[PDB]
Design a protein around this nucleic acid. Structure first.
Lengths: 50, 122, 102, 97, 72, 54
RNA sequence: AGAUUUGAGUAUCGUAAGAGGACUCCCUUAACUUAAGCAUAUCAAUAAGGGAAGGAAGAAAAAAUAACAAUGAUUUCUUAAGUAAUGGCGAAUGAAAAAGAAAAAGACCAAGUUGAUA
RNA sequence: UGGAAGUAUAAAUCGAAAAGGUGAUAGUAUUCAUCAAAGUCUAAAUAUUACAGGAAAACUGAUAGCAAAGAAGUACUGUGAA
RNA sequence: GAUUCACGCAGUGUUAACGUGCAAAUUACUUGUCAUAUUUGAGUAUAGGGGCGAAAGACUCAUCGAACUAUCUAGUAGCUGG
RNA sequence: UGAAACUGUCCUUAGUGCAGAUCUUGGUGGUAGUAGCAAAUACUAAGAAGAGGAAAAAAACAUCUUAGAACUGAAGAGGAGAAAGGUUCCUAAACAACAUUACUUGGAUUAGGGUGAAUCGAUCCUAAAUUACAGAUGGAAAUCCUUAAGAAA
RNA sequence: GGGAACGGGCUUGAUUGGAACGGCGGGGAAAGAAGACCCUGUUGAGCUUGACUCUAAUUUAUCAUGUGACACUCAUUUCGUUAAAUGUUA
RNA sequence: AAUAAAAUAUUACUUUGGAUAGUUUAGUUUCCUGGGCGAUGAAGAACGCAAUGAAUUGCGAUAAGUGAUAGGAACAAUAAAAUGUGAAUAUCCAAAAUUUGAAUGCUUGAAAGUAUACUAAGGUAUAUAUGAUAUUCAAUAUCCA
């Protein structure tokens, strides 16, 4: 909704921040196994349920 | 980081107060430089000034609380921050003097009939 | 078996009284000295329709016996009562329609 | 049941699996008690004596011809032996009024 | 119409986020949390929910103070 | 472990659904839900008589 | 007016709360199951619910056993013993003394007495 | 409760004492034996699959062993408990 | 709490379409109804031997002649399969 | 072929031998290049961009502009809000996957940008109703009471 | 034909060229579902009823000590108020 | 009668798939030592903090870390700056310790807020129950002028 509580909006912003991939420099670390973030979601694929 | 704790300890309270303002003001400028495409030298400097502020505040606070412990060392009512570190259970237990306290009748019995040292011949 | 409708009526969830637009509680005024041993006068200001009951209710206004102010009452209207009428409550009240007597 | 056998009386119809006690700590009770005995041997040194116990007869006619260690000497046995009952407990003698 | 059609009017939340446990388990009309048992002072735990006990209990979080007291 | 393989609320679906009568993992949303359950022959279920430490 | 009694507000110094509950002390009248049915019984101080604790807890110093050539607080182990007993005397349930060991330790209140009483 | 003409607890009524309780077949009588209830504390020997730190193993070896040998109670499902 | 048409809604018939569908109940035409015992949103109240029901054992989150979920529980099976 | 462990004999031990359990888990065939990609009237010409209309008509060609031809027909396939969603909004680069052909298009990929209130709302007031201290009740969990029970409000 | 009494397979015959496209609805006792009709379990559940055995609610009797010889109030019950002239004199 | 396109059969090579073999920073069980939380604000939850981070880890406005004590030359994916005038690293220590949560001035839905007192802001304190002491009271409740 347009109308929302202040703390609810900040939890919406955090979910936007966490919907990002692994940076390139992190993928070049030695002994690295983290290439894709599996905690990723999209608005039309999975509803975050909050 | 470059602030040299020995040099921090050489300043007075007023000098240590003004240094924090100078460090805080410098850190504010470097934060502006980071978002305006600053050089890597300026960004590396910004991490140094961040630790100097933490270092300066550590000496300010440690020197202040050491003076408060001396102030309340003999005081009857000591603030709960300066009391010795204990668990909640420890503050509830009886004092060792109170645990081994004995009645007047029992005190003299242990004085006139103590556990003797002996041995049996075989 | 199940619970009959007469049993479900005693819990009072959807069977509570629909008493939202009711005027109030219709009753005499609290008995005091001035009505045990004297008479008080009340003016019938208006006659209203109390929802959920078939009889009209009268808004009677007694002045006050002991303090300064008003005493707004709510009687069950007797047949023949009219607006602006003076009614009397007390032991020595006359035997007229609308008066409240022992 | 088939053929000749005894009538079986096994009380396993309850939950015995939570009533099972295993003795895997038996080899380490021996070490724990023996070590505590040795530290008991010091501290109270000498004479970690387990207190002198009386000679009493076992109860019932099934055992009454045998002697065994009782608990504590009676006041008359201490008086007969000329021992103060207050000092007796401090020199490793068990007392049982 | 009890299947696909009746799901069109589902736009009112029964539960929102809880302040104490952080789960979307705060019943709005009941005014209590179905997961942590909010305003009730004690945290809601049941012996038949053995998995729910190992999902949120001591040691499942940061242990900010107790990680120092025990090691001391 | 005494609870190894027995940590589900699984029940058999019964007949009439074209699948065997072994208990099935309840719920939905994962690959585990609707799979086999405690049975000795099933994957991730308890084995034949579990070896007791007594 | 003064001497008490009881009950309040405030200030000061403290105390309880919540987590955990494997082991510990309790409350509450489950059923599946077994009895080849089932209703007492069994499952069973069992599950779930509820309260309280500690590094251990509980218990502990005889209004106790016994009938002996007598023992002697409590706890725990061995044996007694699937025994005595209970039970649609069916299915089933079921101890304790004696005896052998680990460890051992006994102390106070009340009441009584002393009152230039403290 | 094994406790069987009542082993223990509780409730309703009743209710002691110039003491008395027990000796498990109810009753009364006389002996005998042994204790002396209706307040409190008490180390040690004992238990432990919480949790933490260690050591072992005729145990498993990636469909096995904990559900989890990787950001595992994670991804994902449900309004929610789960 | 008259008769009708329209916006809407329903579901009389075709026992039409579809029936591994647009759809775990929809589509088309025909038909009916289309404001006072009317329609509808949000808030709120009522909970499982319970609720709610102009009453069909109907509805209570695709679950109802007793919801869902977890524990007792690997319930028992003289019966079927290996 | 494979590159770091293994075998023979005697005893001991067992989570010890599979074709079946609508068995469990995983992988894979025939069906089969098959059924289908047929509601919502509809597209065409020139040009541009692009690797992407070629050619013995391979008869069909996504995006943008213009011209033609059309549909929803103002109780709309128009312009805005509440709930719900949560960045899907805007721009640029880029098209591996996704939208039952393809896509240079996109609600898709990557990176940035974007939400400005004394006057709009929330905040404030009360409605149906809801929940506290003390009190009443209960073995317990807890239940009741909402101004009545209170030196409270 | 016989066979578990209605064979694609077995026996004896009729007969046969390999790969298939479009249709079609005879057969595959075609697919979907551990028959829902019937019976058997010493298997259930909903509902009914002087089926057996119980139970909430209701009801009756006894016990639970207010005074004075029916009368009173003093516990107790149900109320009303801003606890706002109650009772006896004047 | 005839062809071997399809079909069938065996081997080699390749492919789809991930069995088998070798391996293990992970489990399971038994035992030993403790069993050391909280109004001095716990466990849990949320948010935030790295030069380039989304998760995870560590930490709390002094932020992937500060002081002190040990420790002695690294880190690295890339670039910086610092460094024997002391880099990493370790800790029962010191300082500091956001919003909540028993949550405790009042309110709390996803709520933004707000009162008083002490020391414009900032920081403290103010829930309920309860023990002791002090002080101010109330009730002719008992005496009592």
């Amino acid at each position: 909704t347009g109308h929302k509580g202040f703390s609810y909006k900040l939890k919406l912003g955090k979910k936007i921040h966490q919907n990002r991939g692994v940076p390139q420099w992190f993928r070049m670390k030695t002994g690295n196994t983290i290439n894709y973030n599996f905690k990723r979601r999209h608005w039309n694929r999975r509803k975050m349920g909050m | 980081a470059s602030l040299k704790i020995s040099a921090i300890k050489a300043m007075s309270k007023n000098d240590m107060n003004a240094k924090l303002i100078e460090l805080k003001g410098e850190l504010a400028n470097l934060r502006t430089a980071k978002v305006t495409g600053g050089a890597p030298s300026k960004i590396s400097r910004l991490r140094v000034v961040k630790k100097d502020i933490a270092r300066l505040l550590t000496v300010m606070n440690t020197q202040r609380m050491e003076a408060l412990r001396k102030y309340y060392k003999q005081a009857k009512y000591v603030p709960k921050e300066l009391r010795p570190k204990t668990t909640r259970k420890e503050r509830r237990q009886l004092t060792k003097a109170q645990l081994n306290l004995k009645t007047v009748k029992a005190a003299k019995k242990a004085q006139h009939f103590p556990a003797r040292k002996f041995f049996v011949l075989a | 078996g199940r619970r009959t409708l007469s049993q479900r009526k005693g819990r009072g969830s959807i069977f509570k009284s629909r008493s939202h637009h009711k005027l109030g509680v219709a009753q005499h005024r609290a008995i005091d000295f001035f009505e045990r041993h004297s008479t008080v006068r009340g003016l019938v200001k208006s006659i209203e329709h109390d929802p959920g009951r078939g009889a009209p209710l009268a808004r009677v206004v007694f002045r006050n016996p002991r303090q300064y102010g008003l005493d707004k009452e709510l009687f069950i209207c007797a047949e023949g009562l009219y607006s602006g009428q003076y009614i009397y409550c007390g032991s020595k009240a006359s035997l007229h329609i609308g008066n409240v007597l022992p | 049941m088939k053929h000749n056998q005894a009538v079986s009386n096994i009380h396993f119809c309850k939950d015995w699996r939570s009533k099972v006690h295993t003795w895997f700590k038996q080899p380490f009770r021996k070490i724990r008690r023996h070590q505590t005995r040795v530290e008991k041997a010091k501290a109270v040194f000498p004479a970690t004596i387990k207190s002198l116990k009386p000679s009493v007869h076992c109860m019932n006619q099934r055992f009454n011809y045998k002697l065994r260690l009782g608990r504590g000497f009676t006041l008359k046995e201490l008086r007969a032996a000329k021992i103060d009952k207050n000092l007796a407990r401090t020199i490793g003698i068990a007392v049982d009024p | 119409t009890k299947g696909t059609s009746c799901r069109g009017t589902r736009h009112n939340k029964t539960h929102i986020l809880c302040k104490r446990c952080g789960k979307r388990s705060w019943h709005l009309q009941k005014q209590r949390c179905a997961s942590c048992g909010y305003p009730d002072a004690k945290m809601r735990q049941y012996a038949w929910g053995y998995k729910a006990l190992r999902r949120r209990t001591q040691g499942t979080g940061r242990m900010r103070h107790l990680k120092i007291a025990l090691k001391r | 472990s005494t609870e190894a393989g027995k940590q589900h609320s699984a029940i058999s679906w019964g007949t009439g659904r074209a699948v065997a009568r072994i208990p099935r993992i309840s719920g939905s949303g994962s690959g585990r839900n609707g799979q086999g359950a405690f049975g000795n022959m099933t994957r991730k279920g308890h084995m034949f008589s579990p070896l007791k430490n007594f």
